[PDB]
Amino acid sequence: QEQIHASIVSTLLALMDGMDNRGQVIVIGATNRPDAVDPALRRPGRFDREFYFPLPDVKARFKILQIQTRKWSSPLSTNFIDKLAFLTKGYGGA
């Protein structure tokens, strides 16, 4: 590891432990590789509540395809959007 990132972790940890109990600042942080963040910030009093963001299931992909389709001039019937939902097991919203 470099020095400058190691010192960035060494100050972000001390800033998170400095934040008071009457919680008025919340730090949200996002990653696609959670066991590649430093282990220290996952310790109690730090980034400790997690939200897993899985790949969508079939009804979620149906809603996403509807959302992408919404503002087209010529429309798409809901049966075709359901078929395209069942064909895409493994497809994120991107």
């Binding site: 590891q1 020095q3 190691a6 060494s10 940890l13 001390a14 432990d17 400095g18 109990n21 430093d38 282990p39 220290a40 310790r43 109690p44 009093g45």
Partner: peptide
């Protein structure tokens, strides 16, 4: 100095 060497900053509310 570059390792996992930080003290966990405890709270006095435990």
């Amino acid at each position: 100095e570059i390792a996992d060497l930080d003290p966990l900053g405890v709270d006095m509310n435990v």
